[PDB]
Symmetry: C5
Subunit: 376 residues, 5 copies
């Protein structure tokens, strides 16, 4: 009864186009915030952020005010889309094909006129993904909200603190905070300024997944390449093993390309690590070819260079604690012994290069210590 009567009275002469102020000259205060429920996906290749968001827009309709003593029990009303004035707060940097992914729901008003509007939505935002440090990367993705067609003299946008009470963790991202800021900006279209609210979603990538799936396997497959320097040359599989492992590491670079965006702002840390390891494996291929040339040397070819006969069979040989047809066998054994010395020297040197480059590149990430401590 009273609900029917009140609904009939509240729509007499009501125009959903009129801004609901008592004094037309004064701006209308709109309190804006959001509740972030989940970060569903961050597809870095297209530079878009998908979030489950409950935007919270509250304002006051001067006309939707009733005296509850005259409408007993009726303390709130609800109006669907198109029947009540609403703030046209859009996401400026939207990436959704429709550009406005908000789902239009009811506006709950009470007896005093305070309007509460809590549209749910899946919002896609064009976020610049700083991939410099991936997988140890921290992203600051902005969600910029503002009235599309109302300036400061008409819609006085005000900020309320973001809600994360109902947030459900993701698995891949540690929300470090959603600090917000209210700005008063001027635009090259118009003279009246337009205020905006920008929420900076700060998220730290949890590195266990990519860590176990890319870094640890890469390290140990690069380690399978370093076994070539312990394999004997007579096996006739040095080049096979070495080249096969190198061409196997290409799969990791392919996967990164499937994940990463095609941006030239910087070179990804994962990319530098894959590049450094794979170039070192290629150098292992070059050096084993040299070992095989020393090993398979025609005895009646060139003589042993004195430089080599001392730099390998005297110094390096001692450092590592190694130590007519039959004269040629001695000669070839000497050439084969030189091949053995090169194997051990480069084994040690390439082992250290692997150790340094791996540790040196990974600790250049600011977030490395935080990462290893929180995620392992």
């Amino acid at each position: 009864e009273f609900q029917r009567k009140l609904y009939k009275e509240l729509v007499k002469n009501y125009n959903p186009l009129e801004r609901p102020v008592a004094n037309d000259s004064q701006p209308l205060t709109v309190y804006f915030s959001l509740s972030l429920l989940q970060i569903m996906d961050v597809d870095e290749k297209n530079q878009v952020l998908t979030t489950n968001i409950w935007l919270q827009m509250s304002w006051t309709d001067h006309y939707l005010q009733w005296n509850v003593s005259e409408y007993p029990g009726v303390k709130t009303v609800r109006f669907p889309d198109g029947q009540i004035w609403k703030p046209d707060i859009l996401l400026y940097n939207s990436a959704d094909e429709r550009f406005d992914a908000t789902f239009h729901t009811n506006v709950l008003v009470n007896s005093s006129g305070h309007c509460q509007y809590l549209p749910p939505g899946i919002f896609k935002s064009s976020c610049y993904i700083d991939v410099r440090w991936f997988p140890f990367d921290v992203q600051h993705c902005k969600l910029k909200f503002g009235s599309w067609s109302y300036g400061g003299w008409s819609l006085d946008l005000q900020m309320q603190e973001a809600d994360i009470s109902g947030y459900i963790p993701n698995g891949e991202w540690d929300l470090v905070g959603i600090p917000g800021k209210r700005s008063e900006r001027f635009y090259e279209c118009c003279k009246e300024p337009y205020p905006d609210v920008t929420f900076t979603v700060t998220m730290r990538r949890r590195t266990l997944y990519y860590g176990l799936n890319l870094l640890i396997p890469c390290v140990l497959i690069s380690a399978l390449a370093l076994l070539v320097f312990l394999l004997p040359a007579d096996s006739g599989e040095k080049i096979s093993l070495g080249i096969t492992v190198l061409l196997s590491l290409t799969v990791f670079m392919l996967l990164v390309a499937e994940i990463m965006p095609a941006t030239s702002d910087s070179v990804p840390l994962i990319a530098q690590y894959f590049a450094s390891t794979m170039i070192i494996v290629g150098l292992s291929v070059v050096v084993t070819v040299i070992v095989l040339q020393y090993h398979h040397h025609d005895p009646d070819g060139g003589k042993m260079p004195k430089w080599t006969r001392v730099i390998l069979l005297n110094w390096c040989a001692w450092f590592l604690r190694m130590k007519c047809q039959d004269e040629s066998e001695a000669v070839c054994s000497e050439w084969k012994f030189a091949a053995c010395v090169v194997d051990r020297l480069c084994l040690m040197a390439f082992s250290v290069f692997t150790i340094i480059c791996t540790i040196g590149i990974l600790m250049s990430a600011p977030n490395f210590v935080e990462a290893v401590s929180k995620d392992f």
Copy 2:
């Protein structure tokens, strides 16, 4: 004739925004329940569940009532979307881009006023998929339903037991049940509490499919890797079998990556088993290098360390029941080759024992393993 008169009478002064109650102060009892017709696809990369649900919302419209003695033969009327007050019971954890996968259908009513509204839809829900024990894992997926803008004082939501009579099996998931629960929660937006009905769809993965596409194949490829220890070394193909088989085993991890989500909450059992297999095969390659180093040992090189000369050619050799300058060099080479043969067999047995243990000990660490294997096969 009477249908026209009824439809004309029932819309007079009707407002689709007025809760259809007689006493405004009392909440309106709405009964809610769903019907899971099919689980078409549970997405595990985007942590999204997909279902073919037919919701059920029954209430009582105080305004849409008539005396059948006046309107012969019109015992029921139907109203489309936007003409009758309808409960705004949305899914809270929706993953659909429109957020509302409900298809708006008619609202049947009878001569007493009891509305009945069953909307169909392909509901997508953001469900946390516990992948810790995958493929032997019970996902527990919540579908939380509630009126978006009505609190407890206005819409008294009540739960009815879920219907699964028409449920159509899936093939991949054995529905273990869909228990529901009614909650009264408070929100940081508002003071009036809001009740919600949450249906937890509990799903058991049928493991035969993965069983034969990934795990048993991986076991057999790992045995194929294990064959390197039976190859004679003179073939010159030990390392090519080892490394080639390892590279073939990498596709299984690629597949599991293509299915799994990029989550750090846990390490899937499939991942731990695949990783242990990869580590065992890589260690087989390292040991392959060691055996080839012993086999190709220069006769005029280092001497056999007594620790080796006993630990390999005396104890391990007996346990397994094995037993001129060029001739002496061949004799040393012949010894070293015996050491190469002994290492192959010891590591054959040892890697055989680690394969059976690791596989059984990782797979039988899943609580649902027995239920699964006993029923899925």
Copy 3:
């Protein structure tokens, strides 16, 4: 002049909510059928069927009746969606995200009130795909249609024979028929019964494409695997060829997995055949290591067990028609070992050849529709 008058006259007091009967108590007969124009795709992985369908729903509106003598030349009228009552017959087992893929068009009524409504649509239906017999599979995909909110006491649904005259073939699927059936089922929501019309689209997969792109290439590549027993061991490439072929046959399994659903209701025939082929090639590599192990046996090692010396160098040798001094003796003992290694190649050449022939033939002819397949599409 008269079409305008008729259109104005027919909407006087008309309500698109009223079911158009003269006697409210009697149900309204609705004749339901469809014209199947094309089966666009059957994505078996998702268990969905995409079809081009022109549902044919005809009924009688009591109120849309005029006397053509008073409206000369105006013999039919047309009304768009939302202006006249039309039966809300949906596809119950729909798999489309919107759940209702029907495209709403006009309703052609004539002077006697008979309404004809033939909406086109791209329909996705959740069809259980029996993948046991793939590629030689026959599917029975159900399209279940019924009025959502009208029971038998209100809308007397009647079936008309399915139309396939204008059906345009697909390329992969042989429509075996679209037999229909009217059923009266009870539901756990309600007491009034609900009738439905179920069209079972029966489809035979045309086997030439997959059979050329999966089955035959596996046969020939697996035959290449069994050929290792003609390669000599001294080549030093038996293991390379054998393992390379086995690892190459895995890509077919990747494609088969990319196509098929993730179901445990039964094991597909394509998979049992590939698995049986794959294990035979794997066993061939197992035999390969044994051949190279008997060959590369230390001449001064263990002696040939008499049991081996007979099973290989005496009996099997006849059936298949085969037939410094320390170094010479060492070559001699090694020489019998090489021949023993050679006999295993030939025995296992014959034996594994038979396994593939039996395995392949015995698994393929266990499909009921196999003879139809080879006879119709080859």
Copy 4:
């Protein structure tokens, strides 16, 4: 001042359902045509064609007529969807999920009543893609247009010659023409005839892209397969090279599988080329194993059959212009056996070179459109 009055005047008693004819009995002449702007993609796997089309429907509304002397300066008016009667001309064989991809725009009327309506749209049409001759194929894709609910007695559809002046080239397809035809067919639903206008888009695939991406690389990888007969046997990599190149060729059959539809109407030409190439390389591996069997032949076994000793070491050896004591005698027999490996290598090198040449030319020039193709695209 006058545009407001005209718009106010023209909507008095106007009903957008009424066909705008003066005599209801006479059909309404509608002139239909289209402007083809671009062929964005034809995804043959799903058998659908994506085109940018601006359909051109022009007719005469009897009611939207004004005298320009009374409304000076107001010479044309525009009406959006739902306010003016429009022809419901749909694409019968549509493959779009919505089934109607036309974008609804204004209807430009002038003072004489002639309505001009040019809705743009991206149209998906279910087109039969003849993949028999691919990549040297020509397609005939139908765009079938007709009034959905108006027959010949009410809407007399008429064809106008299609416009391609503004056509934007594609890159992959040479528009050979869009000849149209008006047909009047009877349907199994209804008695009143229905006219339709069918545009057969004739498209020739430009073969430079696939000819360099698939044909030439396959030729060259098959040439590396033929190189096995020039490798010495002692290298121990003949089988490695041959099998490696075969598994390299497998990706091309994967690529066509990703491109081509899974239809069994025929075997695509590219598939027939790849199949013949793979068979030739596999047979080359077979012969490679036979040569290795001859090369690694023990000299204590069987003696060389006379047939072999002539067919290889006498005739074929002459035509192609090649030409401790126990160890030497065995080396002589081993040397004789190794010579046989060289003869087979050389004979089969020439023979497998020729069958690649024949197979290549005989399959490529079996397409009628091949010569025109190579002449236009290379």
Copy 5:
């Protein structure tokens, strides 16, 4: 108060179909422009350009004029889609499935009637992507805008300079400018001419990403292929190394195929470079077979043709500074291996030079190479 009065007054007799001019005979000037905020995606395979655009359409409504002295504080009004006449300026060369990706927003009018309309949108346009010079390529994508149904005699379209102040860089594309041009074209449909405004978005591709993912790795993998000529033949892995690296170079051609459109207008520079690389590696395999044929020459076979005995063992050998029956047989076999080694060394220089030329020569055959190398590295 005054806002509601003004809204009531402005909608009396207003028709959103009427073009809002005082004199019907004179065309209505509409100023058109756009603000390009981002180039979201260039999927060249579909020949489509995805951009974030805020089209700017400004005109004057003759009827939406009020005196602010009579409506104090009410200086602007806003009207949603369907309530006021708007210019139907569409993107002619649209590739979006709905064909109109504009998001309909309010039209901000002031007291003098000037209407300001700035709709946002994700715009897909069918743009011819000249892949001739890829990755060092510059694209000129046209966005053609015009009123669909209003010709020059009714809607006098005028262009305003494009806004890029708020443009946010992309990462892969350097916006070189968006020059516009206003045209008056005649169409085969109609007699009244129709003006359009065409914005040519000019984009220079950033080459660091592709430079480091495909060009440099291809060079280094082809160099790895060139190592075959330093490998000794007795290793028995020349053919293995060469052929394996060639199948590895095929992934790059597959990647380019995944990227590039299916166009025959020209051959992309990347494709020509990869093709030359593949020909060099394949010719290296062919000559590798020849050297192995030289090395595995039966000593009792043919004799060395004098041509060979000079061109390899005298000139080329000196240029590169190289220098009983079984004894004779090994001696002749020793020369064949020496001939085999000489061919390897010549091929090392020659194929190195071919590698040097093709790589350097083909890459600077792109006009934009210097611009790229200077800006992108």
